[PDB]
Design an enzyme around this catalytic site. Sequence first.
Site, PDB file in Angstrom:
ATOM      1  N   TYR A   1       6.342  26.302  61.467  1.00 33.15           N
ATOM      2  CA  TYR A   1       7.403  26.248  62.451  1.00 33.15           C
ATOM      3  C   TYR A   1       7.032  27.036  63.712  1.00 33.15           C
ATOM      4  CZ  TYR A   1      11.955  27.576  64.406  1.00 33.15           C
ATOM      5  OH  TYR A   1      12.997  27.822  65.262  1.00 33.15           O
TER       6      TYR A   1
ATOM      7  N   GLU B   1      10.733  22.743  69.919  1.00 30.40           N
ATOM      8  CA  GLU B   1      10.861  23.467  68.658  1.00 30.40           C
ATOM      9  C   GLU B   1      10.236  22.499  67.657  1.00 30.40           C
ATOM     10  OE1 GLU B   1      14.811  23.681  67.000  1.00 30.40           O
ATOM     11  OE2 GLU B   1      14.338  25.563  65.998  1.00 30.40           O
TER      12      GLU B   1
ATOM     13  N   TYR C   1       8.448  21.444  63.606  1.00 23.42           N
ATOM     14  CA  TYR C   1       8.358  21.669  62.171  1.00 23.42           C
ATOM     15  C   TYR C   1       7.324  20.754  61.534  1.00 23.42           C
ATOM     16  CZ  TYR C   1      13.177  23.704  61.920  1.00 23.42           C
ATOM     17  OH  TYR C   1      14.314  24.464  62.046  1.00 23.42           O
TER      18      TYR C   1
ATOM     19  N   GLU D   1      13.219  28.316  55.392  1.00 20.09           N
ATOM     20  CA  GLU D   1      14.526  28.232  56.001  1.00 20.09           C
ATOM     21  C   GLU D   1      15.492  27.842  54.896  1.00 20.09           C
ATOM     22  OE1 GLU D   1      14.747  25.897  59.551  1.00 20.09           O
ATOM     23  OE2 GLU D   1      16.927  26.033  59.702  1.00 20.09           O
TER      24      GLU D   1
END
Length: 190
Positions: free
Chosen positions: A77, A86, A88, A177
């Site tokens: 990440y 952003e 992932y 997460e």
Amino acid sequence: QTIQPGTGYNNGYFYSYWNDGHGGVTYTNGPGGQFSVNWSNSGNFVGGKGWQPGTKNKVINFSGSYNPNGNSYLSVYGWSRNPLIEYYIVENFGTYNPSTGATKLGEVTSDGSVYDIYRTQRVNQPSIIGTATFYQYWSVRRNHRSSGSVNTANHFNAWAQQGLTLGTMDYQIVAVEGYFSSGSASITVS
């Protein structure tokens, strides 16, 4: 050591631990690139170790135990600036596929598995530069695993062919997460 949310460098590696204030999560920085997270009826949190800044061709290794009990992800990440992105590279997840609701752009083969690529826009959401609007890129692994090597170049190159053009790389970590669930994880990055 077990710490409250924050960022810094620990035993050679950058770390970042954030939570929504809900409670039920314990984050501990371990030896070398190791971190451990134990949670129970948590809120939303993200924690992991890696580098600050990251690079576009880093080969990241990770190993350990990942035992989610509900909604959770184990991913590479990070963020990019100019453009603000952003991203992932999801290696494993619990009960919910994170790309649910995202738009599938294509597929890419890397490190022993095909990955499905998605993108979604976050409008006026929190970011490394403040309240902003940006895209969220996703590479979701078809064959789940808790240890292996991720060649980030394969993903960035695949995303570039689909129109993404990362600029300046900010932090880049292997993160666990959690989203209102429980579980345990002990991961070592190198």
